[PDB]
């Protein structure tokens, strides 16, 4: 935590014309060589932002820094000793909270990934992943982004509806199971996880993706939890009733997005498993990383022909 | 913890058909009714072997049982009886299992373990080595009406010993070595050996019904007590999570085959087992939360009685 500007223990919109979005300030016009993502490869929220960058072909426009997977007493850090942890490749800060202080040195609240950072004004555009992926969706189209709209008007209300119960019962739902303070809270969170997986399995037996045969952001947001579920949540958070590999549709959906060009390289299981097992000392005091459930995400899925 | 000079912070006699000594300890523990008692936890795979052998060999009329409480906390095993199927000390109403050890030796130094084979006549411990208790049970009551059955018959002894040796090292104890590992390197080497032994067992149990052939032996029993705990506990709690027993055709068939033999299911209590491991092992599982647990159904028919 950061309390009135020191360490104990941002809702602007990037926009095609530079007009402010529906919250925050304006002056964040889309353009090359200006904007930067600070992420962990471990964090499913930050991961959404990396997936949207690959699908929208934003590599030439958005540079990236990867914080160390080990999130200790200092929160996220720029220690660069772990492969694919890059350091702060902008200012070579040492701690993520530094970028936050630089933007607002009386800042009160959490120091989270991802952060969308403006290299021109040295400040933070956003640290809301749900909104960063909406920017990436359209803000660079005129500049040459790849075609695709992952939040198109006709699906927005279905999308928002999905995002709401997936966030609560699945994205966040695993954390509620894993960090439950009591048996009773654990039972209730984990039951909800699995009751939602069952509902998802049925949806994904009707068509390719959650809303039908188009890929949307609701898919992406589900997917970054799914891809972490067998390697971490099953054992580490004790969501162990079934593995994603036991569901015909969820596992096919897992593999279908995994195998989209560019997506696999966004997935670093070393960061993922080191982060969760070694960082959560209140649930895993030993810091031992489990060998982890067997799976093979490269096996053909057939969901492209089936649907 | 453990007992040091009689203070809370090794028994190797043999019960025999004629009261002669076994290869260790002293003599005088002749088989007979109303003399011998087991103290067990329903959670403990080593204590479970002695419950299974008691059923297979029909020893209920000879051996009475107390079940300690599944929660092993600051006092070691206790006779708190607030848990269903925990019985208290149905002989002396002690408080703690360690009191039984102190009675046998009032300045005892060592661990206080289940199972204990206890002699009601002389108020002492016959044995607290499960591997030897099952061999006593196997033959010592045979002239008194034990059901026919030899689970360590002369012709199979070398094969059974060779199996027990690696099974014990890499699977019965191997899951403990993984779950209690102190470093990543030691966890890695232990969990690797668990799954390597499971792959080899899966190949064995694809050739015939049981480990040595078509006959059940004590090597099967000893394996089985670890297998029956593997999906409910070891997979998550000890991080032995690469594969579940339910993913292996032959191990899962063999797990169900023994489960479904008359008398065996009543020896299995998943409440004790899950409560014991998740709730007692604070160094591994500080919160004491019991995971919902990997899905399985041990009642499904197995086919192994005809397949081979
Ligand atoms: N709403 C934020 C959530 C991001 C978030 O919660 N990130 C976690 C990663 S799991 C984090 O950086 N936590 C650091 C902390 O809380 O100290 C988003 O959507 O981006
Ligand atoms: N070799 C003994 C060991 C039995 C054993 O280690 N039992 C564990 C039960 S899982 C125990 O009572 N542990 C208590 C302790 O070590 O403090 C046997 O085969 O019976």
Describe this structure in words.
The PDB classes it as transferase. 2 copies of one chain form a homodimer. Chain A is α+β, with helices and mostly antiparallel strands and 307 residues long. Chain A folds into 2 domains: 1-148 and 260-307, Glutaredoxin; 149-259, Glutathione S-transferase Yfyf (Class Pi), Chain A, domain 2, CATH 1.20.1050. Helices cover 40% and strands 7% of the residues of chain A. In chain A, the strands form 2 sheets. Chain A has a 4-stranded mixed beta sheet with strand order 4-3-5-6, sandwiched between helices. In chain A, a hairpin with a 4-residue loop joins β5 (115-118) and β6. Chain A binds chain B through residues 180-183, 186-187, 190-191, 194, 234-235, 238-242, 246, 282-283, 285-294, and chain B through 181-182, 184, 187-188, 191-192, 195, 235-236, 239-243, 283-284, 286-295. Bound molecules: glutathione (2 copies). Residues 44, 46, 76, 111-115, 129-131 of chain B line the site of one glutathione.
Give a nutshell description of this structure.
The structure is a homodimer. Chain A is of the alpha+beta class and 307 residues long.
């Amino acid at each position: 935590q950061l309390i009135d500007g020191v360490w104990h223990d941002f809702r602007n919109w990037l926009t095609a014309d530079g007009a402010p979005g529906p919250t925050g300030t304006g002056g964040f016009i889309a353009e090359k060589d200006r904007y930067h993502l600070y992420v962990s490869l471990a964090c499913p929220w930050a991961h959404r932002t990396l997936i949207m960058r690959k699908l929208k072909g934003l590599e030439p426009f958005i540079s990236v820094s990867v914080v160390n997977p080990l999130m200790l007493e200092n929160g996220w850090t720029f220690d660069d000793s772990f492969p694919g942890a890059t350091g702060d490749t902008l200012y070579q800060n040492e701690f993520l909270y530094q970028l936050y202080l630089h933007a607002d040195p009386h800042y009160s609240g959490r120091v989270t990934v991802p952060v969308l950072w403006d290299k021109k004004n040295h400040t933070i555009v956003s640290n809301e992943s749900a909104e960063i992926i909406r920017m990436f969706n359209t803000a660079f189209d005129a500049l040459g982004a790849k075609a695709g709209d992952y939040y198109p008007p006709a699906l927005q209300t279905k999308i928002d509806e999905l995002n709401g119960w997936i966030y609560d019962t699945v994205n966040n739902g695993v954390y509620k199971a894993g960090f439950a303070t009591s048996q009773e809270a654990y039972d209730e969170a984990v039951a909800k996880v699995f009751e939602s997986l069952a509902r998802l399995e049925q949806i994904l037996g009707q068509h390719r993706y959650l809303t039908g045969n188009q890929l949307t952001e609701a898919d992406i947001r589900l997917w970054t939890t799914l891809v972490r579920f067998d390697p971490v949540y099953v054992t580490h958070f004790k969501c162990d009733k079934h593995r994603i590999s036991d569901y015909l549709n969820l596992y096919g959906f897992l593999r279908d997005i995994y195998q989209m060009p560019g997506i696999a390289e966004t997935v670093n299981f070393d960061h993922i498993r080191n982060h969760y097992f070694r960082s959560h000392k209140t649930i895993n005091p030993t810091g031992i990383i489990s060998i982890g459930p067997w799976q093979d995400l490269d096996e053909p899925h057939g969901r492209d022909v089936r649907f």
